[PDB]
C-alpha cells in the first residue's frame, strides 16, 4: 500500500492540545505551581540547584513547542515528565505541591497514553 509522511506533524499537533488542556483554567487549583520556572533565589530555596540539574516548567515547554524545538512527541513528553520528576525529587513526598503534581500528571499521562 501507499506510504505516509506526516507522523511527526500529527504528533506535535496532539502535543499542543495536551499542553492547552494542562493550561486550562479548569486545572488551575493544582496546576499553578508548574506554570512558571521555580524562582529559586526569590523563594530562598538555596538547595534547589543542589538537587535539580535541569529545571523545567510549562511556560518553558510552551515556548519550546511554539518555537518548534521538539522533534516529536517523545521529546515533548520528556520535558513534561522532567518538570514533574523535578518536583518529586525536590519536595517531600507528603508535600501539598507533590499531590498537586501527581494530579496534574494524571491529566497529562491519561492523554499522552492515547494514540494520535
Amino acid at each position: 500500500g501507499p506510504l505516509g509522511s506526516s507522523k511527526v506533524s500529527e504528533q506535535l499537533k496532539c502535543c499542543s492540545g495536551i499542553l492547552k488542556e494542562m493550561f486550562a483554567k479548569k486545572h488551575a487549583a493544582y496546576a499553578w505551581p508548574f506554570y512558571k520556572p521555580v524562582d529559586v533565589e526569590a523563594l530562598g530555596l538555596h538547595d534547589y540547584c543542589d538537587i535539580i540539574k535541569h529545571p523545567m516548567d510549562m511556560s518553558t515547554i510552551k515556548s519550546k513547542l511554539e518555537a518548534r524545538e521538539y522533534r516529536d512527541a517523545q521529546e515533548f513528553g520528556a520535558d513534561v515528565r522532567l518538570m514533574f520528576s523535578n518536583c518529586y525529587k525536590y519536595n517531600p513526598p507528603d508535600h501539598e505541591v507533590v499531590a498537586m503534581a501527581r494530579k496534574l500528571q494524571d491529566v497529562f499521562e491519561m492523554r499522552f497514553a492515547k494514540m494520535p
Binding site: W32, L43, G44, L45, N91, P92, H95, E96, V97
Partner: peptide, 17 residues
Amino acid sequence: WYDVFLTRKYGKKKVAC
C-alpha cells in the same frame, strides 16, 4: 501562589492559596 515570606523563612515551599 507561594507564601514567599514563609517559603524563604523555612527554605521549603509554602503554598498561600
